[model samples]
Target chain A: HMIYLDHNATTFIDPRVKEFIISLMDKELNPSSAHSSGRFAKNLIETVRAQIATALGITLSSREYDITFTSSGTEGNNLIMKNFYDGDIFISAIEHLSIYNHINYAPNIKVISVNTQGLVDLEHLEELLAQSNTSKKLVSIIMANNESGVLQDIAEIGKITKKYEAKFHSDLVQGFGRIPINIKALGLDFATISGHKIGGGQGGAALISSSNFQITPMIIGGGQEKSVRSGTENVLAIAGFGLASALRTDNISENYIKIKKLQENLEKKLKKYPNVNIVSNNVARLPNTTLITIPNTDAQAKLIGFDLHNICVSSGSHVLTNMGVGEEEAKSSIRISLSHTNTVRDIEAFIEAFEEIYDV
Target chain B: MIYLDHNATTFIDPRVKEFIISLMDKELNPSSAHSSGRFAKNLIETVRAQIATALGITLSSREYDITFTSSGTEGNNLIMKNFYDGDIFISAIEHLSIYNHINYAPNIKVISVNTQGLVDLEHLEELLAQSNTSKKLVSIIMANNESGVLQDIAEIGKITKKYEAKFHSDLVQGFGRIPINIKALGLDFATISGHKIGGGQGGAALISSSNFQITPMIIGGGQEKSVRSGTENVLAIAGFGLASALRTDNISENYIKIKKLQENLEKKLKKYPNVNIVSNNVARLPNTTLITIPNTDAQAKLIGFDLHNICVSSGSHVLTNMGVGEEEAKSSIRISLSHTNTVRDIEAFIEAFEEIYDVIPS
Candidate 1:
């Protein structure tokens, strides 16, 4: 059987998510339709909404939420990008292309630097925050780097935002399932989550925030998620995402050792080659991600090299393939991301594929 | 059950169901360039080329782009997003997605519609000539969702082409059921939805005939030309693409047959003088019938029809809100059909209409 390891690029559809979609295909799922099936579908949407809120630790019974279900986390991130409309936006150098692509989005923009470890440079962040003074501000940081598996200290980042009275937004696309998140408790103004990242289908995500925040919708005519994002809710896909969001890394804590064993086995075995380098090895990283640099070669070549072995892995953010990253880090890197479902055999197959390419 | 509301939405074709099942089972996301992902992408390109081929566009022309959207609403919004920097114009008969998605763009000028529910080309010509802006876009509907009345895109395109302005049309209702040549029509942009044309819901496409750069909207991985980025909703999109391909490949001449059925139904409906068919004189999509039967409450007729397992709608707008009683619902009736429909379905509907037709005064 083929081994799939590209969790960072996008996880495999959770078997459960696929089943939910199948069950929904024949039903009347127009959430806005007035028939019995419509009402049932509408309630299904609300039920899934609450499930998503519970996963993020946001309570609807409290102050209510401005939770807008978007087509993709990119769309959600784009919605929060509207924060740039009112105030200056600060993003880290190593953030996802979703943020970096907006380098020219607004007039007043500042780029925060990152250390070699790919962690957000806290010193530069606060320095810029203190200098900004009175204009509204937003600090967008990735909770975890998809390419390097680097984790940022979001609690510390949130404290800095609170001290400056600026809002905090996190691209938790990679970090949500691996690490716990509470937008309300962390005092984050907004957060983006993707369905496929944590084992649901694509085409569904949410831009969740508090009721008090100002949201400018990029896509008009979103009915249920009204104001921020529109288009009829993809009920089955949304339900898949909600159910997927309901799964946490902690629940599958038993699988961590298996993951560590595979990650360590892959890294430990690959270390025999002198040309290889493990990125951000010293930083706190996710158990499922491993970024390795090989003999300065084309990644597409290495990708096809691995593909022949019936294994799935990625060079980096495959979505952002055409980006210009660091000169030193560009050509040699490949990322093998895993999930709770992955096994040690995946690592073995991956190394076998790597051996044929480098002959190390 | 009767589902005459084919304009608002439609059931999936069987081939699409099989495609989705196989696709959903494969652990694939098209964004990755791996063998599986690349293959997924290759599948997408095949579908895109098929969509292009269906629209009479040649891949070798190298003069166009097919951008996938989450839905028809998103496709329409993307066009407006491109022209948001300047003044905009739209026909009065356009869909709500165009109206709501606009969200009061930079500056919007609404063009009026004639009684036939077609766009006023003279008003459009004068407006484009008098426009004092950096850019201009004229959006009109092709086969309106409610009225089923078709706009003359060839004529509108000629006007926009002559005036040095851009043109867009929502071809969701007409894409698969009708034949179109984007280049010949002088259309710079066109949007088509999946659900309206027998693909499933949750996906659509925007065909950009121009090669200029668009202000990137949804920022994500550089997919779908990197302008409207998201994970390719592979299953739904593949189904849509496959369905589009199948539509182009249908050799049965069933389209003409369905058009004949609509004409037959319309001719027979005219026997009752009290029944006033909307836009009867104008060109419309082949299978939709917009009726305003005199003296019958729309809601009452619909409720009565639904009681007999008959389902049709006044419009997509009326389907959403609440508390509009039968009298309010009686304002109009939109009877839409699909290629799958037969003479029997029309006869059954006409029989139902007969029950409520003379219950009220003419």
Candidate 2:
């Protein structure tokens, strides 16, 4: 069996999540239909929405969150980026393709710099937000850089954004369940999360927001999701997303510690190679990710070599190209991302394969 | 149960259902970075290939681009909202998907289809040239959902091309029932749905073969060749792909049988004068018939037909909520035939039709 390490790309669908969602296919009816079947569907979608809201630590009674469903994290990011066209948008250089590409579309936008370690430069971000005379400003930031696995202090970022009164939307696609996120606690007006990234099936993502903004509907018709999103609800995928979102939180700290230990052990093994550099070594990062660069080694070769060894990983910069970055900068590195399902043996197998392939 | 409303939507195929279940068992997301993500991405690519092949278009060709959408409605809306910046043109005989969105466009031009429910190309050309919004989009339905009549999209494409406008064909009804050549036909964009071909609902395909910059209406992760941005419903997509691939090779077999059914259906239809079949002069799909039974209340016919175990549809399935129509209890009844339909079912519908018609003899 292959040793899979690419958790940042996507997580395996939890079998339990699969079972629960697949059962929804039995009564497959249009969620917008007014009949009994449609009522059952509409009810099911709302229940899943509530489940997702609860997972986000927001109770529906407070109406603290508007849980709007999207097709993917890219969509969630785009929704936030385009929904507020009046403002000048601010995003980190390392923002995901969804946010980066959408932000790039705007004529009025500034890219906040990221350090060599891939952490967003907070001072530069604050400077941009402060200088913008445009009263309606929006800041789109990622909670964790998917490539470097570096975590941004969104609560602190939120403090800065709130002072400026700019809407803060976090592309939590890479951060959500992997790290503890309280949107309201982070002072975030909006947050985005993907289903498949959290062991849910693909085709559903959520844009939960605490803001009083009456967002524009992207896909029109069927006044669903309080008229923010208009497609007929994918009951099967949404239910699956809810199941994945509600996975046991008891494992949150346990998996974090276990994955941290694995990352430490893996880095220790990689450190034996003198040219190898571990990204964000001195800063806070995702427990499950290890971003490493070795001198004079081709990133594509690293990816291919790992694949040949039945190990799964990604080249950090290569993955960023879709966001409009040139491919030349992505010369040498691989991102080994671990999931809760990943074990120490998987790391050991990955290291052994790396040793064999890297000639170290 | 004599179910005659295949045109509205078809049920899921058992084989497609089985394959989808197997796909669901494995967690797959195309955007994921790992081996599983690669596998998921590979699955999406293969389905795109399957769709292209079924569509008779080569997969590797730059001329052909297939973007999976949520539904035919989304596909229709995306093409209109993306490719055009100025004015929009749509046939009067179009589905609510096209009609609702375009009718709302700032400079909306409604092209009238004749009594036959086929677009008048001469009148369309006159409208295209005189108005002179050089940058424009022409959305004409390939087959009428209400009439089952096929439009000359090739002819329409040629006219629009001469007018320097893009041609978008809504092929949701015509797709599997008839073959098409997007490039050869000079069509730039086309829309098709999943549920129409027994793939289940909640998904569609928008074939964009043009070189225009599509400003996304649904800007998420720019997923569909960056034309459509959303988390892909891969489960529903795979089912659609499977259904599309299946429809292609076996079309003529059932198509022949459906044509035979239509001939018999026409024989029954000719018996009633008020029951006019629209667009026989123009090419129509073999498996569909639009009955214009004048002075007969559509609701009464639907209820009467259903009571006799012959199920059909009125014009307003999802119309009122769509807000595109202020329709009457329609004077016309659309009887769409499916491959599963039999001689007995056709005769039963005729029996019901005869019972209802004979009561008020002319």
Candidate 3:
């Protein structure tokens, strides 16, 4: 059987979520419309917002956070960065390409450095923020690293941002489903969540912001989502998201532990090869991820070799690899992602395939 | 029911039809560095570049200009709200949402329209020349939603340039149907809706010229061209790009064929007494027609057509509110045709209309 361990990339739509989406599509009502069907869709979106907030331990009344739906996590990132700051923008060194690519268009922005372990250096962030005397300063950091699966101390980061009086935005796409988050406790000004990451149907993300913070609206029309993001609300996708969130929270802790066990087993089996090193092994990581680097083997060669063996594993160098970047930074590294769906047998099969392909 | 609402939204094209289906089951986060994540990311960017190229734009030049919006309305509002904060100026006859948004903005100035429902260019020039204080920006629709009256955006561009005011065009109804060269028109920004042009619902594009800069209203991850920030809607955008590319391939030929059909419909409908065709005399879009049948109630006529299994839009499409009574609306109805509509379908519409008209007063 094919061992599917790439949960970090996306999760299969939960059966219940799929059903909900199909139903919403059939309804065919614009949420903004005043008709009964439109009201039904609007109610559905409200229910989803409440449920998603509950799962994240965020109280709607305590923090007047506006939840606007977006098409994807990348869109959420773009909206926050542009809407929050009219001047210079600061992002961590190891942010996803979505955040990194903004600097190309926004030349006024600065990128703060991160440690080799892919964690943001807080001191550097503070110093950079201090340099920006302007009121329009924005600092966007990911709550969890998508590649390394390393969770950031968002509470601590939020405190620092508050100290500097800088707008704090977190790309919570990787963090939302796999772990628990309290937006109030974390003091995040803005947080982003994607649907497909948590068994929701594709096409939807929520940009949640604290009461004290208000950014410029990214989209405008029909005053949907309180005039923040405007368009026909994706009822089908939003319904799927609500259903997936409800289903996920039911057995999240148990699934997290089970996936972590499989990851540990896979790591133990791979340790036999002296050249293979699992990055972020020393840090607290998400249960379903393992970024491993195999020495002396190039990413392209290893990818081809693994493909021949019908084994699917990602490479860090290949993941971050861009078209114009120089060859020196293109060193190869492999990433094996896991999920609750994975089993010990699948982990064993992956290790066996890895060993056979590498001749180690 | 055969959904004739292709202008509102369309069924996904066959090529990327499976992508949305697979997205329901795929576990790849485009942001994740895992194998599947990277693969999804690559696929998303490839589609973005494809869309940019199909629009005769470069990914780098309008890198910040290419932010994906949830819908065309959002895209239009983003451009209008961001660029024109002082005193907004738009044609009197525009999308309902444009009027709604401008009402929210304090001190909005509207450019009046002629009897033909086209923006009064002389009045617009006078308004721009006289108003040195509040003319922040001017937004004009490329095609009138009600009458399909085409506007000279290139001329508007020259006027806006003369006044040093920004120009934004809502190209939702025009993007694929009409050829747009931003460089030639010297337009500051344009909005494109996905659903109207045979793409998936809930996706939009805000195209920005190299010189213009605007604040983003929908802020989040700071994606798109940075004027409107949000996460990239990969799947819908992919569908949008594919639809746009498809539209570009046969726009010229399709326009000609549609124009012929529209002309034929006009010729047949002209024989009816008291029927005043709004857009037939104007340089209008090939696929759209606005007709006012005097002394006949539009809603009653719509019901009559409905009874015969024919679908058509009531007067002014979405502007039912504005306190315009049903009697006023009942006098006018719109018939919008797409490339998918067969010649037989047009004949059926005529037959259905005649059947409905026979029962109503002249």
Q: Who wins the lDDT comparison?
A: 1
Model 1 per-residue lDDT tens digits across residues A137-181 = 888988888887888888888999898888888998987766677
TM-score of each: 0.91, 0.84, 0.70
Choose 2 or 3, whichever is better by lDDT. 2
The stretch of ten residues in a row with the least summed lDDT in candidate 1 chain A is A317-326
For candidate 3, what is the DockQ-based docking class? incorrect
lDDT of each: 0.76, 0.75, 0.70
Scored against the native two-chain complex, candidate 3 gets a DockQ of 0.22
- Measured with C-alpha atoms, the lDDT of residue A262 in candidate 3 is 86
Candidate 2, residues A1-360: lDDT per residue as tens digits? 788887787766788987786665545346654334556678877887887776667787787778888767776777788877767899888787777765546878888887766667899988998899988888988888888788888888888998889989888887767767667778888888988788877767888877477777656644667767765566666777887777734356776777788888888878877777787788898888888767677887777788888887877652344334344545777888888788779988988888888887
lDDT, candidate 3, B1-362, per-residue tens = 22233344444555545555565555544544445555666766766676676666677774335656677776777667764546667877677667666656775677877656667788788888776564467888888766678888888888888887778888787877877776677777777877667666656777776555666654433444455543355666766777787788778987888787788877778777767777566578887877777677776776676667665655543333323345555688777777766778778777787888873223
Model 1 interface RMSD over true interface Cα atoms = 2.2
Tell me the deviation in Å of residue B60 in model 3: 17
Q: Which portions of model 1 show Cα errors greater than 4 Å?
A: A222-224, A247-251, A254-258, A272-275, A295-300, A317-326, B101-103, B260-274, B293-309, B316-330, B342-362
* Higher-TM-score candidate of 1 and 2: 1
Clashing pairs in 1: A222-A230, B297-B330, B298-B329, B298-B330, B299-B329, B299-B330
Q: Record all residue pairs in model 2 with backbone atoms less than 3 Å apart, i.e. clashing.
A: A9-B32, A9-B33, A71-B231, A72-B231, A74-B220, A74-B221, A75-B220, A75-B221
Please tell me what DockQ candidate 1 reaches: 0.47
Better candidate by TM-score, 2 or 3:
2
Cα error, residue B206 of model 1, in Å, equals 1.1
